[PDB]
Design an enzyme around this catalytic site. Structure first.
Site, PDB file in Angstrom:
ATOM      1  N   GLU A 154      -5.752   7.030  -1.572  1.00  0.00           N
ATOM      2  CA  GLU A 154      -5.791   5.906  -0.613  1.00  0.00           C
ATOM      3  C   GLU A 154      -6.328   4.584  -1.166  1.00  0.00           C
ATOM      4  OE1 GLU A 154      -4.505   5.219   2.455  1.00  0.00           O
ATOM      5  OE2 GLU A 154      -3.763   6.909   2.054  1.00  0.00           O
TER       6      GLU A 154
ATOM      7  N   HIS B 239      -9.005   8.697   4.416  1.00  0.00           N
ATOM      8  CA  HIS B 239      -9.020   7.308   4.847  1.00  0.00           C
ATOM      9  C   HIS B 239     -10.451   6.791   5.045  1.00  0.00           C
ATOM     10  CE1 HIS B 239      -5.065   8.848   6.281  1.00  0.00           C
ATOM     11  NE2 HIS B 239      -4.771   7.731   5.691  1.00  0.00           N
TER      12      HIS B 239
ATOM     13  N   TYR C 128      -3.353  14.877  -1.712  1.00  0.00           N
ATOM     14  CA  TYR C 128      -3.723  14.217  -0.499  1.00  0.00           C
ATOM     15  C   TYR C 128      -4.889  14.842   0.233  1.00  0.00           C
ATOM     16  CZ  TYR C 128      -2.667  10.726   2.669  1.00  0.00           C
ATOM     17  OH  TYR C 128      -2.735   9.536   3.312  1.00  0.00           O
TER      18      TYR C 128
ATOM     19  N   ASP D 294      -9.200  14.399   8.733  1.00  0.00           N
ATOM     20  CA  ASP D 294      -8.539  13.361   7.946  1.00  0.00           C
ATOM     21  C   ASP D 294      -8.355  13.911   6.546  1.00  0.00           C
ATOM     22  OD1 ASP D 294      -7.610  10.635   7.350  1.00  0.00           O
ATOM     23  OD2 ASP D 294      -9.649  10.134   6.715  1.00  0.00           O
TER      24      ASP D 294
ATOM     25  N   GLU E 126      -0.749  -8.727  -2.181  1.00  0.00           N
ATOM     26  CA  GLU E 126      -0.962  -9.814  -1.220  1.00  0.00           C
ATOM     27  C   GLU E 126      -1.459 -11.084  -1.905  1.00  0.00           C
ATOM     28  OE1 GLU E 126      -2.743  -8.905   2.477  1.00  0.00           O
ATOM     29  OE2 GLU E 126      -4.108 -10.518   2.140  1.00  0.00           O
TER      30      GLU E 126
ATOM     31  N   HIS F  72       0.888  -1.164   0.000  1.00  0.00           N
ATOM     32  CA  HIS F  72       0.000   0.000   0.000  1.00  0.00           C
ATOM     33  C   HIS F  72       0.936   1.228   0.000  1.00  0.00           C
ATOM     34  CE1 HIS F  72      -3.345   2.621   1.782  1.00  0.00           C
ATOM     35  NE2 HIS F  72      -2.255   3.365   2.087  1.00  0.00           N
ATOM     36  N   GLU F  73       1.753   1.383   1.064  1.00  0.00           N
ATOM     37  CA  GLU F  73       2.621   2.593   1.111  1.00  0.00           C
ATOM     38  C   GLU F  73       3.541   2.743  -0.096  1.00  0.00           C
ATOM     39  OE1 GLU F  73       2.292   5.120   2.964  1.00  0.00           O
ATOM     40  OE2 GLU F  73       0.768   4.035   4.102  1.00  0.00           O
TER      41      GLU F  73
ATOM     42  N   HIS G  11       1.848   4.458  -2.956  1.00  0.00           N
ATOM     43  CA  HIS G  11       1.862   5.897  -2.879  1.00  0.00           C
ATOM     44  C   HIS G  11       3.043   6.500  -3.664  1.00  0.00           C
ATOM     45  CE1 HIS G  11      -1.495   6.631  -0.343  1.00  0.00           C
ATOM     46  NE2 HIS G  11      -1.016   6.045   0.751  1.00  0.00           N
TER      47      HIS G  11
HETATM   48 CA   LIG Z   1      -4.968  -8.052   3.617  1.00  0.00          CA
HETATM   49 CA   LIG Z   2      -4.181 -11.696   4.461  1.00  0.00          CA
HETATM   50 ZN   LIG Z   3      -2.178   5.371   2.261  1.00  0.00          ZN
END
Ligand SMILES: [Ca+2]
Ligand SMILES: [Ca+2]
Ligand SMILES: [Zn+2]
Ligand SMILES: [Ca+2]
Ligand SMILES: [Ca+2]
Length: 316
Positions: free
Chosen positions: A166, A231, A157, A226, A177, A142-143, A146
């Site tokens: 996001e 998010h 952002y 936020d 994953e 994820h990061e 970015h």
């Molecule tokens: Ca997951």
């Molecule tokens: Ca998992």
């Molecule tokens: Zn993020």
């Protein structure tokens, strides 16, 4: 560092044994020379000065509990790098094999992780809310996504563009994953979140409302916290992406799933070809419909499913 590429072994945050690419030069360093211009992992030693010291080890065995977060940060940056290279033909985050740097053990009891605009930074968590954040491959990807977004669409952002920013990070974090086949699911951060509570996660893509996020545009958050809900309102897009991939009926609209792979191809094309710094949700819909059209034809099922999914979450 200049030295001989070699391979060492250690244990990650969850206790699993893995091999990692290191470099020998008196010490063994966490420096992977086999991917682009290198993946480098640093020790920030509980402080906030970055990047800290390039991780050095005397015998190339990383079995100490202090080593764990560095093993996973380094390993999961290589997996993410592989995913973007093999599936999208993209070399590192800038598209020219830029070096990937990560620091671990940032600050004390820090419950977050972020791409700070030049490198990855991972806290160890307080031990109750989180365990070391680089133990989560969907957190790492994820990061690191970015950084791809900053070099391509440049989504700012905040407000709807930051919620898109996001959601694109949760989408590609989930796809990585699935690509590593590490217990895959549609939830975010579940391997490292609250170790005392099984079955939860930070956010859910298949059902954002399980944690209180909106799953329809009419439920969006409109205040100022936020940065305008980046998010929170990402749930609306996350739910659309989940539908495109897997199908389902949501607020009475039925969507035929077209799979994870097409989902990845459509959103990667939308990100690198059609999104701009201030795109909003309606322009993401247009960008995803154009991408699907480019790849599968204007009368494909894939285009029909991208429209249904956005209709089901209320984005016109
Ligand atoms: Ca997951
Ligand atoms: Ca998992
Ligand atoms: Zn993020
Ligand atoms: Ca050692
Ligand atoms: Ca948990």
């Amino acid at each position: 560092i200049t030295g001989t590429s070699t391979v060492g072994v250690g244990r990650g945050v969850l206790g699993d044994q893995k091999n990692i690419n290191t470099t020998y030069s008196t010490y063994y360093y966490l420096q992977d020379n086999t991917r682009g211009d290198g993946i480098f992992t640093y020790d920030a030693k509980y402080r906030t000065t970055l990047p800290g010291s390039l991780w050095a080890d005397a015998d190339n065995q990383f079995f100490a509990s202090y080593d764990a977060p560095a093993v996973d940060a380094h390993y999961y940056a290589g997996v993410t790098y592989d995913y973007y290279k093999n599936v999208h033909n993209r070399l590192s985050y800038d598209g020219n094999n830029a070096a990937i740097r990560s620091s671990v053990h940032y600050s004390q009891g820090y419950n977050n992780a972020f791409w700070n605009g030049s490198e990855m930074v991972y806290g160890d968590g307080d031990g109750q809310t989180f365990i070391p954040l680089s133990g989560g491959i969907d957190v790492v990807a994820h990061e690191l996504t970015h950084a791809v977004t900053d070099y391509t669409a440049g989504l700012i952002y905040q407000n709807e563009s930051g919620a898109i920013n996001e959601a694109i990070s949760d989408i590609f974090g989930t796809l990585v994953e699935f690509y590593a086949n590490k217990n895959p699911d549609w939830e975010i951060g579940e391997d490292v979140y609250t170790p005392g509570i099984s079955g939860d996660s930070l956010r859910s893509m298949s059902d954002p409302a399980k944690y209180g996020d909106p799953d329809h545009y009419s439920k969006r958050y409109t205040g100022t916290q936020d940065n305008g809900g980046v998010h929170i309102n990402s749930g609306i897009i996350n739910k659309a992406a989940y539908l495109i991939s897997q199908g389902g009926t949501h607020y009475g609209v039925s969507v035929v799933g077209i799979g994870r792979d097409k989902l990845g191809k459509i959103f990667y094309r939308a990100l690198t070809q059609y999104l701009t710094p201030t795109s909003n949700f309606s322009q993401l819909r247009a960008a995803a419909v154009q991408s699907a059209t480019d790849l599968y034809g204007s009368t494909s099922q894939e285009v029909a499913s991208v429209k249904q999914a956005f209709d089901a979450v209320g984005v016109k």
